Design an enzyme around this catalytic site. Structure first.
Site, PDB file in Angstrom:
ATOM      1  N   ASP A   1      52.308  48.823  84.802  1.00 27.79           N
ATOM      2  CA  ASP A   1      52.317  50.226  84.398  1.00 27.79           C
ATOM      3  C   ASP A   1      53.288  50.338  83.232  1.00 27.79           C
ATOM      4  O   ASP A   1      54.495  50.180  83.429  1.00 27.79           O
ATOM      5  CB  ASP A   1      52.838  51.051  85.571  1.00 27.79           C
ATOM      6  CG  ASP A   1      52.853  52.549  85.238  1.00 27.79           C
ATOM      7  OD1 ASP A   1      52.905  52.916  84.054  1.00 27.79           O
ATOM      8  OD2 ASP A   1      52.897  53.371  86.193  1.00 27.79           O
TER       9      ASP A   1
ATOM     10  N   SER B   1      45.798  58.114  67.202  1.00 24.44           N
ATOM     11  CA  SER B   1      44.710  59.090  67.343  1.00 24.44           C
ATOM     12  C   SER B   1      44.697  59.920  66.053  1.00 24.44           C
ATOM     13  O   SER B   1      45.763  60.088  65.451  1.00 24.44           O
ATOM     14  CB  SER B   1      44.998  60.037  68.520  1.00 24.44           C
ATOM     15  OG  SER B   1      44.108  61.174  68.496  1.00 24.44           O
TER      16      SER B   1
ATOM     17  N   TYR C   1      49.304  66.063  74.366  1.00 25.87           N
ATOM     18  CA  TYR C   1      48.735  64.823  73.869  1.00 25.87           C
ATOM     19  C   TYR C   1      48.992  64.611  72.375  1.00 25.87           C
ATOM     20  O   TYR C   1      49.356  63.488  71.933  1.00 25.87           O
ATOM     21  CB  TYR C   1      47.233  64.783  74.181  1.00 25.87           C
ATOM     22  CG  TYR C   1      46.494  63.536  73.705  1.00 25.87           C
ATOM     23  CD1 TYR C   1      46.442  62.437  74.502  1.00 25.87           C
ATOM     24  CD2 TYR C   1      45.838  63.492  72.507  1.00 25.87           C
ATOM     25  CE1 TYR C   1      45.762  61.293  74.110  1.00 25.87           C
ATOM     26  CE2 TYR C   1      45.151  62.376  72.073  1.00 25.87           C
ATOM     27  CZ  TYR C   1      45.100  61.251  72.885  1.00 25.87           C
ATOM     28  OH  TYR C   1      44.325  60.188  72.434  1.00 25.87           O
TER      29      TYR C   1
ATOM     30  N   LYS D   1      51.215  61.656  70.328  1.00 23.55           N
ATOM     31  CA  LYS D   1      50.698  60.821  69.228  1.00 23.55           C
ATOM     32  C   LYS D   1      51.452  61.090  67.921  1.00 23.55           C
ATOM     33  O   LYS D   1      51.621  60.133  67.140  1.00 23.55           O
ATOM     34  CB  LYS D   1      49.172  61.007  69.088  1.00 23.55           C
ATOM     35  CG  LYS D   1      48.422  60.516  70.365  1.00 23.55           C
ATOM     36  CD  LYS D   1      48.422  58.979  70.532  1.00 23.55           C
ATOM     37  CE  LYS D   1      47.349  58.546  71.505  1.00 23.55           C
ATOM     38  NZ  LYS D   1      47.374  57.060  71.758  1.00 23.55           N
TER      39      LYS D   1
HETATM   40  N1  LIG Z   1      38.114  59.297  72.000  1.00 21.30           N
HETATM   41  C1  LIG Z   1      38.870  58.367  72.531  1.00 21.30           C
HETATM   42  O1  LIG Z   1      38.564  57.721  73.562  1.00 21.30           O
HETATM   43  C2  LIG Z   1      40.179  58.076  71.821  1.00 21.30           C
HETATM   44  C3  LIG Z   1      40.417  58.661  70.587  1.00 21.30           C
HETATM   45  C4  LIG Z   1      41.501  58.276  69.833  1.00 21.30           C
HETATM   46  C5  LIG Z   1      42.533  57.576  70.422  1.00 21.30           C
HETATM   47  N2  LIG Z   1      42.340  57.059  71.685  1.00 21.30           N
HETATM   48  C6  LIG Z   1      43.407  56.187  72.228  1.00 21.30           C
HETATM   49  O2  LIG Z   1      42.755  54.955  72.615  1.00 21.30           O
HETATM   50  C7  LIG Z   1      43.620  54.271  73.567  1.00 21.30           C
HETATM   51  C8  LIG Z   1      42.747  53.614  74.609  1.00 21.30           C
HETATM   52  O3  LIG Z   1      42.137  54.642  75.434  1.00 21.30           O
HETATM   53  P1  LIG Z   1      40.552  54.609  75.674  1.00 21.30           P
HETATM   54  O4  LIG Z   1      39.907  55.719  74.910  1.00 21.30           O
HETATM   55  O5  LIG Z   1      40.003  53.260  75.592  1.00 21.30           O
HETATM   56  O6  LIG Z   1      40.573  55.155  77.186  1.00 21.30           O
HETATM   57  P2  LIG Z   1      40.240  54.429  78.630  1.00 21.30           P
HETATM   58  O7  LIG Z   1      38.864  53.859  78.636  1.00 21.30           O
HETATM   59  O8  LIG Z   1      40.625  55.424  79.657  1.00 21.30           O
HETATM   60  O9  LIG Z   1      41.250  53.191  78.686  1.00 21.30           O
HETATM   61  C9  LIG Z   1      42.689  53.469  78.919  1.00 21.30           C
HETATM   62  C10 LIG Z   1      43.210  52.123  79.336  1.00 21.30           C
HETATM   63  O10 LIG Z   1      44.653  52.274  79.472  1.00 21.30           O
HETATM   64  C11 LIG Z   1      45.017  51.851  80.781  1.00 21.30           C
HETATM   65  N3  LIG Z   1      46.252  52.584  81.130  1.00 21.30           N
HETATM   66  C12 LIG Z   1      46.419  53.939  81.294  1.00 21.30           C
HETATM   67  N4  LIG Z   1      47.648  54.270  81.688  1.00 21.30           N
HETATM   68  C13 LIG Z   1      48.313  53.045  81.770  1.00 21.30           C
HETATM   69  C14 LIG Z   1      49.612  52.689  82.152  1.00 21.30           C
HETATM   70  N5  LIG Z   1      50.521  53.548  82.656  1.00 21.30           N
HETATM   71  N6  LIG Z   1      49.908  51.363  82.200  1.00 21.30           N
HETATM   72  C15 LIG Z   1      49.017  50.466  81.796  1.00 21.30           C
HETATM   73  N7  LIG Z   1      47.753  50.714  81.426  1.00 21.30           N
HETATM   74  C16 LIG Z   1      47.468  52.015  81.406  1.00 21.30           C
HETATM   75  C17 LIG Z   1      43.796  52.222  81.636  1.00 21.30           C
HETATM   76  O11 LIG Z   1      43.771  51.427  82.858  1.00 21.30           O
HETATM   77  P3  LIG Z   1      44.586  51.878  84.172  1.00 21.30           P
HETATM   78  O12 LIG Z   1      44.282  53.368  84.487  1.00 21.30           O
HETATM   79  O13 LIG Z   1      43.933  50.963  85.202  1.00 21.30           O
HETATM   80  O14 LIG Z   1      46.034  51.519  84.064  1.00 21.30           O
HETATM   81  C18 LIG Z   1      42.683  51.695  80.732  1.00 21.30           C
HETATM   82  O15 LIG Z   1      42.673  50.249  80.741  1.00 21.30           O
HETATM   83  C19 LIG Z   1      44.597  55.357  74.084  1.00 21.30           C
HETATM   84  O16 LIG Z   1      45.893  55.192  73.500  1.00 21.30           O
HETATM   85  C20 LIG Z   1      43.974  56.651  73.565  1.00 21.30           C
HETATM   86  O17 LIG Z   1      44.949  57.720  73.384  1.00 21.30           O
HETATM   87  C21 LIG Z   1      41.145  57.235  72.379  1.00 21.30           C
END
Ligand SMILES: NC(=O)c1ccc[n+]([C@@H]2O[C@H](COP(=O)([O-])OP(=O)(O)OC[C@H]3O[C@@H](n4cnc5c(N)ncnc54)[C@H](OP(=O)(O)O)[C@@H]3O)[C@@H](O)[C@H]2O)c1
Ligand SMILES: NC(=O)c1ccc[n+]([C@@H]2O[C@H](COP(=O)([O-])OP(=O)(O)OC[C@H]3O[C@@H](n4cnc5c(N)ncnc54)[C@H](OP(=O)(O)O)[C@@H]3O)[C@@H](O)[C@H]2O)c1
Ligand SMILES: NC(=O)c1ccc[n+]([C@@H]2O[C@H](COP(=O)([O-])OP(=O)(O)OC[C@H]3O[C@@H](n4cnc5c(N)ncnc54)[C@H](OP(=O)(O)O)[C@@H]3O)[C@@H](O)[C@H]2O)c1
Ligand SMILES: NC(=O)c1ccc[n+]([C@@H]2O[C@H](COP(=O)([O-])OP(=O)(O)OC[C@H]3O[C@@H](n4cnc5c(N)ncnc54)[C@H](OP(=O)(O)O)[C@@H]3O)[C@@H](O)[C@H]2O)c1
Ligand code: NA
Ligand code: NA
Ligand code: NA
Ligand code: NA
Lengths: 249, 249, 249, 249
Positions: free
Chosen positions: A64, A149, A164, A168
């Site tokens: 975590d 982001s 959020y 960021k």
């Molecule tokens: N539209 C979008 O999806 C979008 C847009 C721009 C930026 N982002 C950024 O992209 C990044 C990846 O997110 P994603 O979109 O791929 O979402 P996701 O599919 O929900 O993946 C998030 C990942 O982070 C892990 N995680 C969450 N909290 C954690 C913690 N405390 N310790 C360790 N692992 C943790 C989750 O697994 P566990 O819950 O099992 O720990 C999962 O592996 C994030 O920083 C997000 O802000 C996403």
């Protein structure tokens, strides 16, 4: 080939079990890197191994990133088992829909509102400090990539975004001050902020998102591989990547 | 190969006679694109032809991008001779060292201070309007790349910068509002701001720059080829590229 | 009383015939300042004289701030007739609804798109250079106030905004680089960017604006009088002022 | 008189024992407000009572704003003893000189690096949530003022700044998203970010600061009283205040 200097090196990728981080782990491993993929739930990371076609590998570890103790345990295991951290990818992050306050009847819990800061901003600070201590111990100029982001660079109109964007904006400033500090001491470790617009992952950004343009996780991983591939003397400070026709929220 | 859709297409590159723009013209031509390189002085552009190894070409045309009439004459020649503009690279720009005022005894001329706005901000507005009118006439979703600066995103400490940062802040906002407008009307033309730190070119940024980290023109052209190579559904809104250990001015 | 040092001094206010600039001229004159109000059409400025209750005055002069010659003629008249410029208020500005391109069928003319840059960005550069040359000739530390916009700090969603945001991003960078340059040479002239959200004036921002929160011109003038009133050692670099409940466009 | 609506109301000011927060408490009390000044060490707050000349008051309460439990205990005491919170001033903050990493031999402790985020960013989130819950319970449109920094809007060159800028970038985004959320639900509570440059306080920003321009705490408190005095329909979103001739770090 610009990825040759990276074959056989070690990358740590947080948030490896889903989404963008799972796609980064497969693309890095296919490029010959040995990836340590970490998340709170490791089962899905173990499963990515069947997609590795190249000469790299994927190893799952539980962590975590909001917890200084869990981060220190993971970095100690990496140091004991794989050695130097060459690439650090701070990709783990969360988003909870709703408000800071209850003026709209959708206030998020205090636990959630604190968690978003701890995971999305504290997590990359703690991991970057361990990664850089490993790199400098090993006399190696590696690369820190922070998954930011578009909302680290503008304030969303949607009132579902709470803190959020604050987290960021935090990460934008962190990333730049870290690269500032390395440069001021003539250290050659690279730092990149990669800032996506909407990506189809397990993060629910908009519940009604089926008609919206959205990147794939591989599109983002492709951009991360491009910034790692750039020459040792070339930094990509920021790479903002968005689906075409996006209307930011 | 991601550059296949671009082989045989037409790119217009302003500021082609020197520096970053000369390197973009050779890298595009080597990728099979037919480049129209423009500047106020065309002799050096003609000379780049001897560096083309690939199947593209470089054609020199004279144009001062600050002049609406010169820009319209160049776009009319392109339309009459090559047809659709597929890629537009707004790279021409100037920088004059000294002050807005004379409080430091280094005030720049009124002609120069107006010129910096006209070339660095008006120029890309006029060229982007002609390029997009050509693309939409031809039913083609092309790519506009604007060569910005780190100083389009922070205010330099140096008092030699006058209104240069203002012009590049202008270009940051222009670039984003243009992509906003295309997206709002569901048009798929791409727009990228590429923002370099120090690059060794004919632009004198710091007279005492021999010991400072500096990109090469090819490093910047390499980043421009990466953003053009990205898939039709993927925008790179911003790519900031700086030499490693840079201390911004 | 903090406005005492300003009684009997000379302020120049561009865009004095309407809106925010007309309200600034009356509030300054009521504070005992002698105002020179300028615009392309002076009839309405002459009429503000009947609202002066205090000991200051309002003098109308014709000037198009986009024209270096007209600006030089106005500053020469001021120098010949009133002497030192103590306060400069760069308030004139324009906005034309529609697009940079015709992708939405609402492209603005090339004359208009060039005019928005010339008035909103070149105008304040030219006026600030004349004002500061007057202040430093007279050994006086005056105050430059630039009327910016919330859109000088974020990119509007509306595709009616064309290059208006670009011009105001320009003005944000200009304002900061000007104050940077004065400070670097240990000069004590003050510079403020005042950035309003929607204000009810003659500028049509949204045709359907009757239900939207909107400041009054006096609200903005009130904020300008506050920043001029601050002590000689205190700068207000930026004052963003918006109506309560505003939803930016 | 614009401060009349505030006489007899309750303001909470964090970081009341020193510096800017101590000056805000005296200026508010002199304006007739009943201030609850909080800090981890309350002795100096008790002493400010002897400077109150007006009809307001200052009450000391102990609170560490990084702790959700301490913040909830302080807000419960306020609710039980004084009633509605009308003004919230999030002024408490810290800065520790040195690096995120040890590349310069000045790495700050992990406790300190986490503390800077918890106090400077989590603290204002927690206090704003309690203050707004009190205001909306009481059907009162109050005012949240967050004491930010110029470093919440640019990245310092100094490598002594670690994650301080990150925390203030966090606060810039928080402040704007909070006002966004209130506005989107048609709630009329005001939010202001006041961003100082160097101020002479107990915070050591630069050890070698004796020759640098510096605001006084009262200069900042004066600006806070101006933003609270503005009319109920007028928001000051951001007020950046710096000493004249400042050269940001
Ligand atoms: N539209 C979008 O999806 C979008 C847009 C721009 C930026 N982002 C950024 O992209 C990044 C990846 O997110 P994603 O979109 O791929 O979402 P996701 O599919 O929900 O993946 C998030 C990942 O982070 C892990 N995680 C969450 N909290 C954690 C913690 N405390 N310790 C360790 N692992 C943790 C989750 O697994 P566990 O819950 O099992 O720990 C999962 O592996 C994030 O920083 C997000 O802000 C996403
Ligand atoms: N450190 C750096 O060099 C640096 C850093 C970041 C950003 N940039 C940006 O990089 C871009 C390219 O500049 P550079 O560094 O490569 O400088 P450069 O070597 O001086 O090249 C500038 C090019 O622009 C042309 N040009 C200038 N004014 C023009 C006009 N009115 N019409 C048409 N062409 C014009 C020049 O040729 P003519 O004089 O013959 O017309 C020359 O071909 C500029 O936008 C600059 O702001 C440079
Ligand atoms: N919602 C808003 O209204 C709003 C929001 C934020 C920022 N602003 C800024 O507020 C400032 C004042 O505009 P406003 O809202 O008060 O609009 P306005 O009522 O239309 O007033 C504009 C004033 O500028 C003058 N002007 C325009 N072009 C000029 C030029 N070339 N030379 C000299 N004077 C010129 C106009 O008179 P002439 O046409 O007779 O020359 C008029 O006196 C502008 O900078 C605007 O961008 C307005
Ligand atoms: N140059 C400058 O001084 C400058 C520049 C721009 C912005 N700022 C901002 O100004 C604000 C006020 O700081 P200052 O300059 O006045 O510094 P200061 O004199 O050190 O005052 C800081 C105040 O915050 C209190 N505080 C610190 N941590 C706290 C916590 N966990 N819980 C509750 N109270 C806490 C301190 O008292 P305790 O230690 O007893 O709790 C003290 O009362 C800060 O947000 C700072 O970032 C200062
Ligand atoms: Na980098
Ligand atoms: Na793009
Ligand atoms: Na000022
Ligand atoms: Na406000």
């Amino acid at each position: 080939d610009p990825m040759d200097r990276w074959v056989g090196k070690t990358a740590v990728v947080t948030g490896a079990s889903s989404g963008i981080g799972a796609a980064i782990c497969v693309e890095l491993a296919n490029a010959g890197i040995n990836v340590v993929g970490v998340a709170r739930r490791t089962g899905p990371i173990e499963e990515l191994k069947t997609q590795v076609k190249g000469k790299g590998s994927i190893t799952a570890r539980q962590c975590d990133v909001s917890s200084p103790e869990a981060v220190a345990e993971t970095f100690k295991w990496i140091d004991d088992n794989l050695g130097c951290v060459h690439i650090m990818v701070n990709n783990a992050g969360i988003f909870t829909q709703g408000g800071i306050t209850d003026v709209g009847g959708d206030m998020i819990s205090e636990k959630d509102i604190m968690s978003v800061i701890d995971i999305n901003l504290k997590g990359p600070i703690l991991c970057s400090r361990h990664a850089i201590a490993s790199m400098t111990r090993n006399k190696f100029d590696g690369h820190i990539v922070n998954i930011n982001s578009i909302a680290g660079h503008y304030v969303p109109w949607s009132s579902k975004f709470n803190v959020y964007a604050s987290s960021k904006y935090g990460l934008t400033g962190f990333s730049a001050s870290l690269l500032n500090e390395l440069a001021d001491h003539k250290n050659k470790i690279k730092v990149t902020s990669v800032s996506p617009g909407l990506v189809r992952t397990a993060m629910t950004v908009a519940a009604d998102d089926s008609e919206m343009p959205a990147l794939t996780p591989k599109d983002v991983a492709d951009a991360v591989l491009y910034v790692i591939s750039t020459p040792p003397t070339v930094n990509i400070n920021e790479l903002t990547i968005t689906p075409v026709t996006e209307r930011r929220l």
